[PDB]
Amino acid sequence: PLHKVPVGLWKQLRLWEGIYSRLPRHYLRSLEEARTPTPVHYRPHGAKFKINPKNWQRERVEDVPIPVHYPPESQLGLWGGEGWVLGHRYVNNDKLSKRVRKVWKPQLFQRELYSEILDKRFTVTVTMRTLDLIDQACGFDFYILKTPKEDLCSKFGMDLKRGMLLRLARQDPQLHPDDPARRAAIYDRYKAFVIPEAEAEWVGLTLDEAVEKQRLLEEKDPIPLFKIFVEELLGQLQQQALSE
Amino acid sequence: VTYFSSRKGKRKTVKAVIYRFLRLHSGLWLRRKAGYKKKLWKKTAARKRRLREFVFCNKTQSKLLDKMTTSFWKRRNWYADDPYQKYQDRTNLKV
């Protein structure tokens, strides 16, 4: 026997059926297409073509990303899109020596970050790279709004993004309750990033959180049959009164 | 020698045969003489000359080298400037 459809497409046809079908289109579209993550550990070479040193002929040259590992703690902090590099190495770097299993862990630090939009000080575990990108993006909130999903890698980062994006689209008065001036200032320079309201609340979610939120938005306890029967009877009586 | 490959199921070639030998289309294989770059100051002018020369292999060898080489190296080749092209045909051979 065989399977009517291959298994890699089982995971896909999971989405085409049931409650997933009722999820909003924008969410799905965002989930499907994955922009390729900015190289962190491996170092890319720009040119599509190279010239072989020994062979002396142009060579089609491609880039393969190095698999990196994200521990469960990393999902709680901002590591700058990096993690553990698992691999092997040759001792002495002579290919002829012993091959040995090895793991490079990133260096972690405890730091505090300030939000204009969330108006708060968070204690986050960050990497050097995280502070560098926070630097180059010129704001913490800039760093979070200016970055794609694949580059943050953290549930914390994406729920941060979702939170403050929602706060932007709501135009919340709670931001700086006593100062309309600082509201003007703070909201203005991020006004590049404003997204509509129905989009903002779905942006940080995970498929379980999506399924759950959708479930809750779809809950209606079944209408008593008495209701529908009364409606039908009234319809019949009105049609009978009108025909006469 | 791999008689059936993993991915293509074809028959693989031994590359170490392709680096030291040359197949003419007659079927003669042509090889360098062992130790020609080795310890020259010891040897006579005579031996040096004998070492610089190319040579032909007996039936037992050519046969063996053929089993380690796919169809692609038994192919007829016309190169521009090909030195050996004048040597690839057999003439006046009455067996």
Binding site: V40, H41, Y42, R43, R60, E62, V64, I66, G80, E82, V85, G87, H88, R89, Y90, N93, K95, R99, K102, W104, P106, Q107, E112, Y114, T127, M128, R129, L131, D135, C138, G139, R189 | -
Partner: protein
């Protein structure tokens, strides 16, 4: 951040098919280390007068140690951002004015 390279060349798949990886593509030589690199300069703008570094409304080059943990958190300095530089084109053209 450790920058890493593979010892064994990976074959190609170019039609959009994903690259087919084997176990020998898991040995790594360490090419470069980020934390062993020399530090750069942080270009900032001062909203006030810092003791050694600068007068109010000036362009400063700090190091990330002093810059990240002092100026930006306390509100002493802001980032090099162009939109934030126009602000001091403004303050500077209204300074020598009045």
């Amino acid at each position: 951040t450790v920058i890493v390279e593979r010892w064994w060349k990976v074959p190609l798949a170019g039609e959009g098919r994903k690259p087919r990886l084997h176990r020998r593509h898991r040995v790594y030589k360490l090419v470069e280390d980020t934390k062993h690199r020399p530090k750069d300069n942080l270009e900032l703008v001062l909203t006030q007068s810092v003791e050694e570094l600068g007068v109010r409304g000036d362009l400063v080059s700090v190091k990330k140690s002093v810059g990240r943990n002092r100026l930006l958190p306390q509100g002493l300095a802001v980032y090099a951002s162009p939109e934030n530089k126009k602000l001091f084109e403004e303050e500077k053209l209204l300074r020598q004015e009045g």
